[PDB]
Write a protein that binds this ligand. Structure first.
Ligand SMILES: Cn1cnc(Cn2c(=O)nc(Nc3cc4cn(C)nc4cc3Cl)n(Cc3cc(F)c(F)cc3F)c2=O)n1
Ligand SMILES: Cn1cnc(Cn2c(=O)nc(Nc3cc4cn(C)nc4cc3Cl)n(Cc3cc(F)c(F)cc3F)c2=O)n1
Lengths: 298, 299
C-alpha cells in the first residue's frame, strides 16, 4: 500500500508555456483554448496588488507568447474567467483527451502533474484539505500546474496551482478560476484557516492497513456513531457522516470489521497515541487516501 | 517532502499485453521489439518449476498474442535472454522514446507504472532495498510492469516486475532479464533475505533537513569511512561505498557539511537515539529519498 497517482500521459500532452513580458508560467491546452492563471499578466510591479480587469484591457493578443515544446502557437483571442485566463489559438491540440472540468470537495483526492516552463517534471497525489489548501510539492515556476482524476479515458481536471502560502502549503483554483478557500491571486501573505483531519480517509487507510496485514491497533471496544463524533470533534477531526459509513461498507465487508468498530480503534489511537509503533510504515495517521483510492488499490 | 514519480506518458505509450494460451501479462514495446517476462510461456502446471528451454522450443511466433489495446501486433521473431522474452513484431512503435536499459543499485529509486492487461493504472516511487526486493504495490496481472527514471527526454528502464514474495514485497529483473537478488522465476516460496537501512539515503535526508534549517543533530565530531561502516553494520545500516560518498558530493557542497562529518552525526543518532525529538517533523529517519531526489525537491 503506497500513494499512487493516475498515469499522467493524457495531461502531459496538454501542457504549454505562457509568457507575457518577463512573467512566465504553465498553461493547459485543450482543443483550441489555452487555460492558465491570470497572474501571468502581472509585471512584478502588478503582482503585489493587481487590478486584473485593468491589466487585461491594456493587453493585446500579440502580448501573449504560447510555446508548445518548440512551436509557438498564435493567440487569436483572449478572455478572463475569474482567476483563469483563456487564450484562443489558431490550432487545435491533437493530443486533447476526453475531459471535464469539475470542482472537488474537501477530502477528495487527485493527481498533480507538477510542471516548469511548460515541461512536466513529476506526478503525485494530494487531497483537498478541509481548510481548502493542498500539501503539494511545488517550486518557483510551477504556477499553472494542474490536478486531475481519470475515469475510463476521461480526464476530470479539478485544480490549477496558483501559489504557496507562508506555511509552505498550496492554494489554487478550479478550472473555472474560482479559488478553493478564502485566498486571492495577489502576492501578499495569506493564512489559511485551521486545518482538520479527514476522518473517513483515516478510516479507509486503517482498512488498507488490515488488508495488508497490519492489525495491532484493532480493539474489541465499540462505540456509537455520535460518541465517536464527539471524540473526533474534540481532536479536530472532521465529523463522520452516515454517508461516509455507507461508503466504507465495501471495505468493512471485505475485512469483516464493522465501521463503528474501526471507529472505536481510531478513537483509542486518538486518545492513546501509537506508543512508538507504526501503521503501514507511518508514525502518523494518514488522511489522504479516500475509500475509493483504497478499494482501487487493494 | 513528498514521494514524486516521473510523468509516466513516455512509458504509457510503450505498454502492451502479451498472452500465451491463457497466460497473460504486460510487455514493453520499444522500436520493433516487445520485452516481457519469459514466465508468460508457462501454462499453470509449468509455473512451479518450468523448463524454459523446453517450453520455448515448442513455441512458434504464431503462438504469441501481443496487443496494443485491442490492436494485435504480429510477432515475426522470438528469443529469450536470461529471464525475459524478446518478441520481434512487424511494426516499430511510433511512441518509442529515447531510452536505455540500466541495472540499478540498492538505494536508487525509480517510478513504477503499474499495469493490468497492458493498460496502465497507476504510478508511484519505489526504492530498491538492500535485500534486492522492492516495497511495491502490485496486484494479480501486474507481471511485466516496469520501473524507470527519466533524465531529460531519455527513459532509463531499470526494473521489470515478475513476482510477489510471501512477505508481500516484490522481486523482478532488469530489462536484460537478470534478477535483482538471489531470485528465480518459478512459482515457489522464496524468502527475501534480512533487509537493512539505506545509509546513503538517510544521509541525504539529513542533508535535506540541514538545507531546511533543521540542524540540531549536527554534532561536533568526524569519523573515518571505515569506522563508520563498522558501526553502521551493528545497527543494521548498510555500509557506504565510494560511489555513495560521491553521490553525496552536491549536498555536501551545498551545505558545507563534509560527508564524513555528516557520518559522525548519523553515528551519534545510531548510538543514542533521537532523545524524543524529531527531524523534518519526524521521529523516524527516511531511507527512500536518494541524494538526487532531495536535490530535486529542494532546488
Ligand atoms: C515556491 N512555489 C510553490 N508554488 C509556487 C508557485 N508560484 C509560482 O510559480 N510563481 C509565482 N509567481 C510568479 C513569479 C514569476 C517570475 N517570473 C519571471 N515569472 C513568474 C510567474 C509567476 Cl506566477 N508565485 C507567486 C504567486 C502566484 C500567483 F499566482 C498569485 F496569485 C500570487 C503569488 F504570489 C507562486 O506561488 N511557488
Ligand atoms: C499479487 N501480485 C503482485 N505482483 C504480482 C505479480 N504476479 C502476476 O501478475 N502473475 C503471476 N503469475 C501469473 C498468473 C497468471 C494467470 N493468468 C491467466 N495469467 C497469469 C500470468 C502470470 Cl505472470 N505471478 C506469479 C509469478 C510470476 C512470475 F513471473 C514468476 F516467475 C513466478 C511467479 F510465481 C505474480 O507474482 N502479483
Amino acid at each position: 500500500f503506497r500513494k499512487m497517482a493516475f498515469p499522467s500521459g493524457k495531461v502531459e500532452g496538454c501542457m504549454v508555456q505562457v509568457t507575457c513580458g518577463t512573467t512566465t508560467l504553465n498553461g493547459l491546452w485543450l482543443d483550441d483554448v489555452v487555460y492558465c492563471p491570470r497572474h501571468v499578466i502581472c509585471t512584478s510591479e502588478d503582482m503585489l496588488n493587481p487590478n486584473y480587469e485593468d491589466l487585461l484591457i491594456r493587453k493585446s493578443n500579440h502580448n501573449f507568447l504560447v510555446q508548445a515544446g518548440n512551436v509557438q502557437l498564435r493567440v487569436i483571442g483572449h478572455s478572463m474567467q475569474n482567476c483563469v485566463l483563456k487564450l484562443k489559438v489558431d490550432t487545435a491540440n491533437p493530443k486533447t483527451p476526453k475531459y471535464k472540468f469539475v470542482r472537488i470537495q474537501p477530502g477528495q483526492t487527485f493527481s498533480v502533474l507538477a510542471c516548469y516552463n511548460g515541461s512536466p517534471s513529476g506526478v503525485y497525489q494530494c487531497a483537498m484539505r478541509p481548510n481548502f489548501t493542498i500539501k503539494g510539492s511545488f517550486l518557483n515556476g510551477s504556477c499553472g500546474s494542474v490536478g486531475f482524476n481519470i475515469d475510463y479515458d476521461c480526464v476530470s481536471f479539478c485544480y490549477m496551482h496558483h501559489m504557496e502560502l507562508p506555511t509552505g502549503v498550496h492554494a489554487g483554483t478550479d478550472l473555472e478560476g474560482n479559488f478553493y478557500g478564502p485566498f486571492v491571486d495577489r502576492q501578499t501573505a495569506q493564512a489559511a484557516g485551521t486545518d482538520t483531519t479527514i476522518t473517513v480517509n483515516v478510516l479507509a487507510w486503517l482498512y488498507a492497513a488490515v488488508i495488508n496485514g497490519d492489525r495491532w491497533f484493532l480493539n474489541r471496544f465499540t462505540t456509537t456513531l455520535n460518541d465517536f463524533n464527539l471524540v473526533a470533534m474534540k481532536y479536530n477531526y472532521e465529523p463522520l457522516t452516515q454517508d461516509h459509513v455507507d461508503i466504507l461498507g465495501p471495505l468493512s465487508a471485505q475485512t469483516g470489521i464493522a465501521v463503528l468498530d474501526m471507529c472505536a480503534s481510531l478513537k483509542e489511537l486518538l486518545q492513546n497515541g501509537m506508543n512508538g509503533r507504526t501503521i503501514l510504515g507511518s508514525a502518523l495517521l494518514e488522511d489522504e487516501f479516500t475509500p475509493f483510492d483504497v478499494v482501487r488499490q487493494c
